[PDB]
Amino acid sequence: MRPPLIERYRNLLPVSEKTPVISLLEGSTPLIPLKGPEEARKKGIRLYAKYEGLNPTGSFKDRGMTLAVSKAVEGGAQAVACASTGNTAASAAAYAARAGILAIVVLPAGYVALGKVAQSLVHGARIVQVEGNFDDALRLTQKLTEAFPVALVNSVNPHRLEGQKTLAFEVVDELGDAPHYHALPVGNAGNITAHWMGYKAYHALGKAKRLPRMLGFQAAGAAPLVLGRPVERPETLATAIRIGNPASWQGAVRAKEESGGVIEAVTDEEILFAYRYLAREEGIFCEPASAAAMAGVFKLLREGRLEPESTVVLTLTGHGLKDPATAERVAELPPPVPARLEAVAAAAGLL
Amino acid sequence: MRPPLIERYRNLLPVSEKTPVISLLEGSTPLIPLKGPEEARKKGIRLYAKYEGLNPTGSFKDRGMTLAVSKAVEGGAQAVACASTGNTAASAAAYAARAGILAIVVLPAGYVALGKVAQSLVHGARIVQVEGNFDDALRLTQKLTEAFPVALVNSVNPHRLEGQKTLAFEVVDELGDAPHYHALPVGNAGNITAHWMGYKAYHALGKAKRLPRMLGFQAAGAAPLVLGRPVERPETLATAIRIGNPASWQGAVRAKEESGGVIEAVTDEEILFAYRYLAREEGIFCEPASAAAMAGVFKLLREGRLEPESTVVLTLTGHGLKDPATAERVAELPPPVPARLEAVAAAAGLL
Ligand SMILES: Cc1ncc(COP(=O)(O)O)c(/C=C/C(=O)C(=O)O)c1O
């Protein structure tokens, strides 16, 4: 039912009958139609959540990583490396283990979500925590791949974006056309770039009449693409996108311009509100960075910038399980009570 | 555009045109073929992992919750409740948020993995932590639902087994037949019961040529089914199955006897070994309780109790992200180093 992504889109990918397919059966994730928000519903605006949290490692990074490691192995690579806020690393770690090769991940000290650390650890990856942020780990890791015979699997590797563009193909395959708008978070910018590549590709093939407007959102304390210049000290509780100098900078600007979309900023508070809304009202638990997409939609809706009767697809990038710690910021765990029908019923608000 | 689990198997489920479908697009999870291990491959025994960690809330529980909540709302239920070691509660909280009703979850204080706690919290369930174990909470929750107008969604509710049995349907649909063996964890015994149900069904319907042996595995410190009597003080790091008086006790026993299988114990050490093996050797990150199934296979493989030239399927019940704390048990996180290629190469072990 959920075939190797490489196999599903073999026709549109730079692969051949000799490409070793290293796959954990990624992609083909649910496109969940949302109930609200109330604002959008009484405006005929329909929202769909492309839940990338259901990929093998819990994020969309598996999409780009399956093609990257597959091609790397095709080249005889026996190790890969990458800088990461957490998810790309977890993906490299898992696929390396799958391929039977070595994985080296460089993370920003103290700025990687507990779940993501747990993954690299258990998958037996070679972890290097550096005293710097993501942008520092990215530059460091690029050299690391030039000092040792290790394949770089960061978005700079063309295969990453080639694989990630498959998400747009899946959205069109399921809806029958491209949506009026597609919202997503923007970190190092590889994803928004890949999305746009996918939509233009299906459009040129005549599988999508319309080209959607790409709506990219960044945390206010790490919005380089929104200010128009790098952010040396990016900050945000949504650590997945605590990036101040996106590698695919031009890719995103181009995607924005060509699609007629935008790349704006949402505050950490708005992120947490959207974060809570999705889990509590829609039953969809994504990580804070992913919630930035919904927070961006709330923003545009609030400003009356979304046309009535339009379709909005949001790429919810990572599963909520990736960042357990943040759950404590939108709800508190009640203290224990005696194991008695009376005590429980009272604590349950039934008495 | 992609049907909910209830729809994929509507003809085999207790639903009708009157049943409102509460779905998060669950089921249809990957059946990943494993590379080994060596003991198996040498005997010509192939293994496949049904990765239920990729269901919407990260556990096979979604299969039953979708049917249980839908059937609850069809009957007018305004709230649902369940005792839980974490996954049934997370599932319940999510499907309740989806259906727009209340979810009350009774958790054993101190014995629910934090990923699972983060889920119930963010999804907005009314959490009640009791000073007792799962068995205590289940007993209390059954009394609570018989006392107040709240539908019980624990596996005691037959709808949960009807939903979960679909896993076997999917395994057969993909493999074309049922495996010689099917191993899984046994906690409150609802899953093994449903597995046999689904297999006996497809077999009679002519879809399943043979019948699997059903190999259930419990943690040594919480193996009432292996002991023959309830375990008053269940103990194990795999808190998901820290259960001493399984509700589906009879269903588990009959499934064992009827399929000519076994319900055996595995140590926590064997669990960890299996846990690391799957994530580091196969690239699949499941939680400890899930690994108990692989630990059982390693056990039968070494005891020479698995027939050569056989197919073995394993139900990996939950995603590793559910319980990140256990990662430190099989791997340590290296302390930070300066942001210098020089220092990173050293920390990477490349010198
Ligand atoms: C959940 C989640 N949501 C959004 C992004 C932003 O996507 P891009 O704009 O394509 O970079 C990330 C990024 C992660 C990393 O860059 C890494 O892990 O190294 C993420 O984990």
Ligand SMILES: Cc1ncc(COP(=O)(O)O)c(/C=C/C(=O)C(=O)O)c1O
């Ligand atoms: C990952 C995981 N693996 C295996 C089991 C055992 O299956 P059952 O024998 O059908 O109960 C559970 C059980 C969880 C609960 O019983 C609960 O959450 O209340 C689990 O979370």
